[PDB]
Paper text:
The strongest impact on activity with residual rates below 25% was observed for mutants L42ALYRM6, Y43ALYRM6, and F89ALYRM6. Residue F89LYRM6 of the accessory LYRM6 loop forms a prominent supporting structural element for the TMH1-2ND3 loop. Density for the β1-β2S2 loop was visible but less clear precluding modeling of side chain positions for H91S2, P92S2 and H95S2. It is remarkable that a single mutation affecting a contact point of accessory subunit LYRM6 with the TMH1-2ND3 loop causes structural changes in three central subunits and over a maximal distance of more than 50 Å. The mobility and structural displacement of the TMH1-2ND3 loop segment observed in several independent mutant simulations is in agreement with the cryo-EM data on the F89ALYRM6 mutant that showed the absence of density for the ND3 segment involving residues A37-Q47ND3. Eight of ten mutants of the tunnel showed decreased complex I activity below 20% indicating functional relevance of the tunnel. CAVER analysis using our model of the F89ALYRM6 mutant revealed disruption of the CAVER tunnel at position of the β1-β2S2 loop. Missing density for the L211-V212ND1 segment in the F89ALYRM6 mutant map precluded its structural modeling; however, simulations supported the existence of differently populated conformational substates. Taken together, we demonstrate that a single point mutation in the accessory LYRM6 subunit has a significant impact on the energy conversion reactions of mitochondrial complex I. Our high-resolution structure of mutant F89ALYRM6 and MD simulations show that structural perturbations originating at a contact point of LYRM6 with the TMH1-2ND3 loop propagate to functionally critical loops of central subunits at the interface of membrane and matrix arm.
Numbering used by the authors:
A (entry chain 9), C (entry chain D): 2 to 87
B (entry chain 1): 1 to 207, 219 to 340
D (entry chain 3): 1 to 36, 48 to 127
E (entry chain W): 63 to 122
F (entry chain U): 2 to 172
G (entry chain 6): 5 to 184
H (entry chain L): 1 to 89
I (entry chain 2): 1 to 469
The structure:
């Protein structure tokens, strides 16, 4: 098959989490599968980014209510005309 | 942004002048093949006659019949005008000189050439008469039947390059052109190109006024020079004439704008001389031959040319296989 | 013998396409800054062109050859943030 | 902002301009005399465009192969050989059956002149 | 081809250092955002302890 | 690994390395000087580059942070090669990559300058340009006489320098 | 030039409504060709420039041509969208629109919860970070990898697909010949 | 996923409540296949793999072959009845 | 070896004349026989439920699927015998039972597409094979195009198969959108707990199942089975049923599903009481298939259902095949032949069949009582082994609905008997021409299997015990 083949013919974005889950599932028989629950979780949110979307909503809920906003090393946005300007 | 719009209106003024003068050229060489003069009535030596005809036909009464969709009948000229002209981007007049350098140029040139069938078929539904339909049926049937073998010859040529970029093919053709090994393919591609415009070797359905006429007229000769451009890049050398390195090491001493000017002149002079010999051969085959019945045409395409093309599909990867010569990306 | 009149509109077709190709080549070289175009660009060479625009400072293909890179080169590095893809 | 898209939008401007010039410029002035069920067709007419499409789908199925021709060397070559030959057999079906002919319904009436 | 793979680790070390710096910068940034409010920003959502570059930022 | 489409907007980061990791100075060569000296970077820095990628293989998934110490040394050794080649062969290294910025960075079109550069670097920096994986009974491509694939126009400075190296007996 | 995808989504909605309500059967088919073009716009927009020209070549240039070719030389009666005919349909159209729409939006989600399944389909707002890694040395684009995996790993699918193309040759012939 | 879902749903409901002619049913079938293509190719782009692109390039060919088969089926429907009804088959 | 036959056959059939078609079918008949006889020793590969995956986890070959392909070949040998052999040498049966030129082509392409479903491991193999067999049923329906009913049936079957193929494609890509995978080998007993694959896998099973004729969407298929001619409909009733059900029984993705249990109850209800007041024999005969597909939707809920399935499959196949062949044979004795494609329609037309060829009524009675499930016959052990799996696994209301459905379905099975054992005024005494030796031997073989096949139950259970466990 095309199990882990990416668009360039390499390995896809979640190949390594999947191969860790299959390394799990190779050395285990059933009745003993409840221990490779974390690897599968690591695979699934590799796919869909559910917990990162939850975490970033939790942090954006807090930065919306600050009058201060950001006291940090900030991030700049450039036009595509000006990647290496100065 | 001044740069690209000045470049594109330079390209547009060149190609939309050269489709007008192709008309003046076909009348004159059809005349001299028939031992008479061409037009000399309207220019100093007959030139700007296509201008005279366009000036008059933009003064001509447009008739929208009782039978007709009016909207369909006047925007089938434009959809055939626009896709007969859109395919002029990807042709190179030199290495990397196109109006858009995209890495899938043959896929684009092949997708636009399949969009050109509609303005035949669709405009049969204009003026719905029982004979105004099945003539369009025969037209579109021939049109699709020969763009099959057109696409086939394209994919046979890409077996040597393995890249859908177009100037990559021409840089690949520096060692040899592709007509010199595959000369039967030059014959097959020439006759498929003659069929795809429905030229009067391969015409049956010939055998409006004003804007729906001049749009179809311009689309016809833009298709002439566009399939001639396709022949020029993938079968003959695109902009390639000879080496011209020794001549430059005599003439020049370093890169200047006059040296790039001279090099572009040589490259597009080679490309234009291929294209001009090809358009002359289109008019030259128009002059000498009678036309086809529909059955001779369908028998010709599906029963004669296509099995031979299957044999070519089998033979060319096999010789690329026998000697371990597969083209790399 | 050879009709000159028959081959003059071919002569103007030839001259128009020749002058168009020459003018377009000089327009391309003026856009690049004195060098030829790149006619087939990889994903690798796309990434290499944006890296050299980052390194040279503003200019397209100036092509600096320096020993060790400047000070703002470690800080002008770009990531691309792409929209939700609704 | 490339020189690719000004073309895409500018070719219609060309057309819209010219058919404007005529519609804006020329005489309309029509009338009745200036203005102005279903037929049956042979099977090969509808057949050429119906059987056109399975050959077209093969020709664009070769298009992934001829871009990958180096990577599958000696192996994808034989898979493509088998693919092409499987479709050549359906083609020799088609030309052995004489499918795409429209054939003329009246002969010289070959049947001989016998008597009594 | 052999030229490009001679060049590969040289640019890979580059983009690795850029990834490390900008990710630790983003981590410290949202730590400086949610001071006060009790919330773990150092904690990975991945259950494995391997390091990962962040994604899915808020548009500016 | 995938490329950005559909309105990507670029953004950069006003920050610094932490104190834990020492300073490393960067490579300031662009693509034509990098592609020019690629084989000599690969000839000198083979075990360093291979230890870096072997690090990246050995501790899977940690990746970035657990391989920084050798990603330091691959950059420093390549910088050593590039200033080494500057201070010995600046004019013909420059001749080479100025040929290479025309002709789409194709190595196929700059043979007469790369012969000069290979001769200088081999006698003075004592590094040889080799293509591995090439068994004998197979000629290397940048050694062959009358190749099928010649460039469009040979650069003028390099054919002049090549002829003058012929008449000096340099090459 | 941010809202491009939203614009193609809206224009696709409008084009389908013009497909299903049209005077003339081929006015409806030209709206379908326009919907193919809107599709190819979306496919270039998302990053798949190869597929858009594959859609224009195969769907527009063969399937729509076959379809228009059918409508020309065959007779097809058509009623137009009377309001007497079709507002007897509208209450179930509305119920099935809302239900099938929400239900198609449902299965991208993993909750026990019904409307946490629904509103995670709208939790879209976060901008993916694109990183450069220098691990790939050659111009393997997408058509190359389709040609590698149709031909090595799924070669059997390509040969069963050849049998399907063979059937698409044999069948239309076998119907429409009337052997002698 | 939105564009493929809504073209599939609107295409489906235009197929279902078609009472006017037969070729609206054909083109609603083809636009359903388009919507399935849209959803799958978006998932292939988001997951960084070709396998959705593999199923999409195979279902392009299968959609073409079904159009050829079914339109020859309509032609044979039309052979014995030189009319196609508005209400349906 | 099907591929060889197709490749050889369309080459050979393009060059034959139409005078040779019947003999061509005879050739293919014998060909398939020697693929059964000379090549079935491959059962030795599948000892102790050894399973292979072929073409890179693309196809899956176990002994279940080996039995299914043996069954499909046996049925194709029977059907191709029905086309390739004359019933009688009249000028009547030549204008009735006549094969087209491209019929055996579409037969073998459909058998190919039906085998690549049961042998399938991934979803795109499943898809490509489903459309291969679907286009083949479209064209097998439409090949007798000089018929209003068959043309209308092919159009209806095209549109209703197109919808339910797009539903399968939607379910497959919907499965792909939550799991970067194509296998159900991906599932492996833990993912189903922590992932809601219920809506996906059930929508997949439903889109596969509505093509069989399960109950909310059953009427279009009953109309296709009544409108097709009598030789076509014995093939298009059987083959998608056994191919799609043999896929869905091998892949256990709807275990203890509430939706499949609702639709199985509804299928047993609407098939039993649906065909009660019906006067056409193919209608009557198609609601039997609706109920007997309900009995399979029951086994879809089951884990480890391979005995009950395979037994009831070859049961239903032999009984189905025989009851269509008996009413092929009864056409000689009816007083009224309409409708050249479908010469017997109304079930009252076989009314005096005991007084003309009483052993045809013995045949008929045997296969009808096996449809009911009478214990000396083979249909009883099929229903018995289905009950032994239904009750073992907790489906107690389903059991009583099964029993009531079988009791209600016995009425219109016995209505065939009630019509055929009756008085008729003008009975046959002396008929000059004979029914085909080759083809009446097949009906007698199919009866002797049904009556005396309970003998080998313990042999079959022991061979089952070794090759599947
Ligand atoms: C092409 C060459 C074929 C010509 C054959 C020989 C010429 C000839 O006399 O022919 C009639 C010849 C007898 O002629 P005649 O009337 O008895 O005597 C004529 C006088 O000699 C008078 O003869 P002439 O003066 O016409 O020819 C003299 C010849 C020799 O004169 C010289 O010695 C000077 C040569 C300088 C170079 C001339 C370049 C010509 C460029 C032509 C362009 C391509 C055509 O060259 C010329 O001077 C011709 C001038 C052409 C000017 C054309 C203007 C177009 C300008 C367009 C601008 C484009 C940018 C550039 O009989 C035959 O040749 C029979 C064979 C016919 C078939 C041959 C076909 C082969 C070519 C196929 C070409 C496909 C296109
Ligand atoms: C791009 C341009 C480059 C083109 C170069 C080619 C040049 C060609 C030379 C063109 C010469 C113009 C001669 C054109 C000419 O017949 O108009 C005469 C008028 O009487 C003039 O003579 C009136 C002459 C009008 C001349 C132009 C007036 C200024 C421009 C106004 C816009 C036509 O009367 P008409 O009532 O039938 O014309 C109208 C009108 O054309 C239509 O739009 C109406 O729909 C129609 O009902 C009709 O009533
Ligand atoms: C045609 C052409 C294509 C057209 C496309 C347009 C439409 C696309 C949407 C696609 C749908 C296609 C239609 C599919 C048919 C319907 C499918 C369907 O009901 O399965 C249900 C959905 O199980 C949900 O979890 C229940 C799902 C709930 C859904 C909620 C819907 C909300 C709508 C609000 C308005 C399956 O439960 P099931 O029977 O296994 O039952 C479960 C049981 O509930 C659990 O307790 C057990 O754990 C388990 O063993 C089993 O017993
Ligand atoms: C273990 C799994 C269980 C399998 C159960 C098997 C079922 C079918 C097995 C069939 C194997 C068949 C063995 C039978 C061979 C013996 C046999 O009766 O000859 C055939 C039937 O010949 C098949 O019909 C040949 C049918 C071939 C079907 C092969 C299927 C495999 C009947 O000729 P027959 O005498 O009535 O009639 C002929 C003929 O009428 C006259 O023209 C001639 O004068 C003279 O030849 C006369 O004899
Ligand atoms: C008598 O036998 C015949 C011929 O003689 C042999 C012909 O040439 C032909 C071909 C007929 C022609 C070429 C007449 C062409 C008709 C015209 C109205 C010429 C129009 C010119 C143009 C449209 C040029 C337009 C250019 C622009 C608008 C410039 C844009 C910047 C035919 C059909 C024929 O039957
Ligand atoms: C030279 C021989 C050539 C091969 C002939 C093969 C023909 C295929 C025919 C299929 C339909 C006819 C019914 C035949 C049933 C055969 C039973 C059987 O044996 O099937 C097995 C059990 O079946 C099961 O679980 C359940 C099967 C249920 C069977 C219920 C029907 C019972 C009564 C009919 C069968 C007994 C007839 C015997 C008459 C002497 C499972 O598969 P196997 O790998 O062990 O097969 C091996 C058979 N070999 C050796 C002849 C290849
Ligand atoms: C590109 C190169 C094309 C050269 C075209 C020259 C033709 C010519 O110059 O034609 C001159 C024209 C027409 O003159 P005429 O009286 O109709 O010719 C009669 C000749 N007899 C006597 C032999 C029959 O006069 C003009 O004022 C037109 C001025 C506008 C010129 C626009 C040029 C656009 C290009």
């Amino acid at each position: 098959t095309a199990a882990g083949i990416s668009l360039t013919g390499g390995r896809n974005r979640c190949f390594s989490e999947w191969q860790s889950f299959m390394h799990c599932t190779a050395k285990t028989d059933a009745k003993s599968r409840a221990q490779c629950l974390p690897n599968f979780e690591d695979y699934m949110e590799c796919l869909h980014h559910t917990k990162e979307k939850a975490r970033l909503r939790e942090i954006e809920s807090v930065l919306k209510q600050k009058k201060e906003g950001l006291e940090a090393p900030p991030v700049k946005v450039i036009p595509v005309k000006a990647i290496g300007l100065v | 942004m001044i740069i690209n719009i000045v470049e594109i209106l330079i390209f547009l003024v060149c190609v939309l002048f050269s489709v007008a003068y192709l008309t003046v050229a076909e009348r004159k060489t059809l005349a001299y093949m028939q031992r008479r003069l061409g037009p000399n009535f309207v220019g100093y030596y007959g030139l700007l006659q296509a201008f005279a005809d366009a000036v008059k036909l933009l003064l001509k009464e447009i008739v929208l019949p009782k039978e007709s969709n009016y909207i369909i009948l006047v925007i089938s000229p434009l959809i055939t005008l626009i896709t007969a002209l859109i395919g002029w981007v990807v042709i190179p007049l030199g290495p990397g000189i196109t109006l858009g350098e995209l890495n899938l140029g043959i896929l684009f040139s092949l997708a636009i050439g399949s969009l050109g069938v509609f303005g035949s078929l669709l405009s049969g539904w204009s003026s719905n008469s029982k004979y105004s339909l099945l003539g369009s049926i025969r037209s579109t049937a021939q049109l699709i039947s020969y763009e099959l073998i057109l696409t086939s010859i394209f994919i046979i040529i890409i077996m040597f390059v393995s890249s859908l970029n177009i100037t990559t093919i021409i840089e690949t053709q520096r060692v040899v052109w592709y007509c010199i090994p595959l000369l039967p393919l030059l014959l097959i591609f020439f006759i498929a190109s003659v069929a795809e415009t429905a030229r009067p070797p391969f015409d049956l359905t010939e055998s409006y006024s004003g804007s729906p006429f001049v749009f179809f007229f311009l689309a016809e000769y833009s298709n002439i020079i566009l399939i001639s451009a396709f022949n020029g890049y993938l079968l003959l050398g695109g902009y390639l004439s000879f080496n011209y390195s020794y001549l430059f090491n005599i003439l020049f001493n370093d890169y200047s704008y006059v040296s790039f000017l001279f090099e572009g002149l040589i490259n597009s002079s080679a490309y234009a001389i291929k294209l001009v010999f090809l358009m002359f051969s289109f008019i030259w085959v128009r002059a000498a031959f009678p036309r086809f019945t529909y059955d001779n045409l369908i028998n010709f395409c599906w029963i004669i040319l296509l099995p031979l093309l299957f044999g070519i599909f089998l033979i060319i990867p096999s010789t690329l296989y026998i000697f371990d010569s597969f083209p790399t990306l | 013998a050879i009709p000159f009149e028959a081959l003059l509109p071919y002569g103007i077709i030839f001259g128009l396409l020749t002058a168009g190709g020459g003018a377009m080549q000089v327009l391309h070289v003026y856009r690049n800054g004195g060098v030829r175009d790149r006619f087939a660009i990889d994903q690798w060479d796309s990434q290499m062109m944006e890296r050299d625009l980052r390194l040279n400072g503003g200019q397209g293909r100036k092509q600096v050859d320096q020993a060790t890179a400047p000070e703002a080169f470690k800080h002008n590095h770009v990531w691309k943030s792409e929209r939700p893809l609704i | 902002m490339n020189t690719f898209i000004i073309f895409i939008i500018l070719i219609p401007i060309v057309g819209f301009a010219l058919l404007a010039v005529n519609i804006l410029l020329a005489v309309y002035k029509p009338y009745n005399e200036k203005l102005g069920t279903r037929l049956a067709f042979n099977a090969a007419f509808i057949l050429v465009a119906i059987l056109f499409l399975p050959f077209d789908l093969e020709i664009s199925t070769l298009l992934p192969y001829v871009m990958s021709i180096y990577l599958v060397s000696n192996y994808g070559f034989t898979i493509v050989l088998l693919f092409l030959l499987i479709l050549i057999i359906g083609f020799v079906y088609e030309i052995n059956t004489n499918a795409l002919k429209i054939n003329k319904h009246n002969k010289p009436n070959t049947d001989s002149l016998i008597y009594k | 081809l052999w030229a490009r793979i001679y060049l590969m680790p040289l640019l890979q070390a580059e983009e690795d250092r850029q990834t490390v710096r900008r990710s630790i910068a983003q981590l410290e940034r949202e730590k400086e955002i949610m001071k006060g409010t009790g919330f773990d920003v150092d904690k990975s959502v991945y259950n494995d302890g391997k390091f990962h570059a962040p994604a899915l930022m808020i548009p500016p | 690994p995938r490329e950005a489409a559909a309105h990507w907007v670029p953004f950069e980061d006003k920050a610094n390395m932490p104190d834990n990791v020492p300073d490393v100075v960067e490579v300031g060569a662009t693509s034509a000087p990098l592609l020019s000296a690629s084989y000599f970077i690969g000839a000198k820095c083979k075990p360093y580059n291979d230890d870096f990628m072997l690090c990246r293989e050995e501790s899977q998934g940690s990746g970035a942070i657990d391989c920084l110490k050798e990603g330091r040394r691959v950059t420093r050794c390549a910088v050593s090669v590039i200033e080494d080649i500057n201070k010995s062969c600046l004019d013909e290294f420059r001749l080479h990559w100025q040929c290479l910025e025309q002709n789409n960075h194709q190595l196929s079109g700059c043979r007469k300058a790369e012969a000069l550069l290979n001769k200088c670097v081999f006698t003075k920096l004592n590094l040889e340009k080799k293509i591995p994986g090439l068994r004998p009974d197979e000629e290397p491509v940048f050694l062959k006489k009358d190749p099928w694939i010649k460039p469009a126009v040979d650069d003028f400075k390099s054919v002049r320098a090549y002829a003058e190296a012929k008449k000096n007996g340099t090459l | 030039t941010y809202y491009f995808i939203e614009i193609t989504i809206f224009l696709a909605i409008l084009c389908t409504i013009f497909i299903i309500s049209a005077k003339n059967p081929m006015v409806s088919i030209l709206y379908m060709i326009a919907l193919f073009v809107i599709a190819a716009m979306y496919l270039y927009l998302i990053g798949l420039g190869i597929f858009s020209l594959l859609y224009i070549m195969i769907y527009i240039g063969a399937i729509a041509v076959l379809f228009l070719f059918i409508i020309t030389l065959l007779d097809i009666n058509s009623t137009e969208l009377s309001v007497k005919s079709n507002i007897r349909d509208l209450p179930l159209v509305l119920i099935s629109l809302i239900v099938l729409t929400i239900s198609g939006l449902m299965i991208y989600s993993n909750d026990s919860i019904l409307i946490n399944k629904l509103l995670e389909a709208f939790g879209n707002d976060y901008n993916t970070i694109i990183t450069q890694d220098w691990f790939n040395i050659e111009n393997t684009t997408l058509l190359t990898t389709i040609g590698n995996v149709l031909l090595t790993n799924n070669a059997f699918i390509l040969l069963v697909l050849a049998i399907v193309l063979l059937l698409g040759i044999i069948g239309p012939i076998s119907i429409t010949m009337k052997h002698k | 996923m939105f564009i493929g879902t809504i073209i599939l749903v609107l295409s489906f409901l235009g197929f279902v409540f078609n009472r006017r002619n037969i070729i609206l049913a054909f083109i609603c079938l083809e636009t359903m296949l388009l919507g399935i293509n849209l959803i799958l190719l978006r998932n292939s782009v988001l997951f960084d793999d070709i396998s959705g692109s593999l199923f999409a390039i195979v279902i392009i060919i299968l959609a073409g072959v079904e159009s050829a088969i079914g339109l020859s089926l309509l032609v044979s429907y039309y052979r014995l009845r030189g009319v196609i009804n508005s209400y349906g088959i | 070896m099907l591929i060889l036959a197709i490749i050889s056959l369309i080459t050979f059939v393009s060059m034959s004349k139409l005078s040779d078609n019947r003999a061509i079918i005879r050739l293919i008949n014998i060909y398939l026989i020697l693929v059964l006889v000379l090549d079935s020793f491959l059962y030795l590969l599948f000892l102790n439920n050894q399973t292979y995956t072929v073409m890179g986890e693309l196809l899956i070959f176990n002994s279940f699927t080996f039995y299914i392909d043996m069954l499909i070949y046996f049925i194709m040998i029977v059907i191709s015998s029905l086309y390739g052999y004359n019933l009688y040498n009249n000028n009547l049966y030549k204008t009735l039972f006549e094969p087209k030129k491209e019929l055996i082509i579409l037969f073998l392409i459909n058998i190919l597409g039906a085998l690549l479903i049961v042998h399938s491991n991934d979803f795109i193999t499943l898809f490509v094979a489903i459309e291969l067999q679907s286009y083949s049923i479209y064209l097998i329906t439409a090949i007798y195009n000089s018929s209003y009913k068959a043309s209308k049936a092919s159009m209806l079957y095209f549109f209703m198969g197109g919808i339910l193929s797009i539903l399968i494609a939607y379910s497959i890509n919907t499965y792909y959108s939550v799991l970067n995978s194509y296998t159900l080998h991906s599932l492996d007993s833990l993912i189903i707990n922590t992932l809601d694959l219920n809506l996906i896998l059930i929508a997949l099973s439903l889109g596969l199942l509505f093509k069989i004729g399960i109950a909310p969407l059953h009427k279009w298929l009953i109309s296709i089975y009544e409108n097709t001619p009598i030789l076509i409909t014995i093939y298009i009733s059987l083959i998608p049923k056994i191919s799609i059900l043999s896929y869905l029984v091998l892949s256990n993705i709807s275990i203890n599903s509430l939706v499949i249990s609702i639709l199985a109850i509804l299928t047993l209800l609407v098939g039993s009481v649906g065909g009660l007041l019906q006067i056409k024999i193919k209608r009557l005969l198609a609601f039997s298939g609706l109920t007997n597909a309900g009995y399979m939707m029951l086994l879809l809920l089951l884990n480890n259902n391979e005995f009950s399935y395979l037994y009831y499959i070859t049961q239903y196949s032999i009984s189905h095949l025989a009851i269509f062949m008996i009413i092929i044979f009864s056409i000689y004795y009816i007083n009224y032949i309409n409708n050249q494609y479908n010469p017997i329609i109304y079930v009252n037309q076989l009314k005096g069949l005991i007084h003309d060829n009483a052993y045809l009524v013995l045949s008929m009675a045997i296969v009808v009582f096996s449809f009911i499930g009478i214990p000396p016959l083979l249909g009883f052990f099929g229903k018995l082994n289905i009950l032994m799996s239904i009750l073992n696994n907790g489906y107690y209301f389903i059991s009583i609905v099964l029993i009531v459905a079988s009791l209600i379905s016995a009425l219109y099975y016995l209505y065939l008997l009630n019509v055929s054992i009756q008085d008729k005024n003008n009975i046959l005494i002396n008929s000059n021409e004979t029914v085909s030796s080759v083809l009446s031997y097949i009906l007698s073989s199919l009866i002797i299997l049904i009556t005396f096949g309970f003998i080998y139950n313990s042999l079959i259970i022991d061979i089952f015990n070794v090759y599947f466990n």
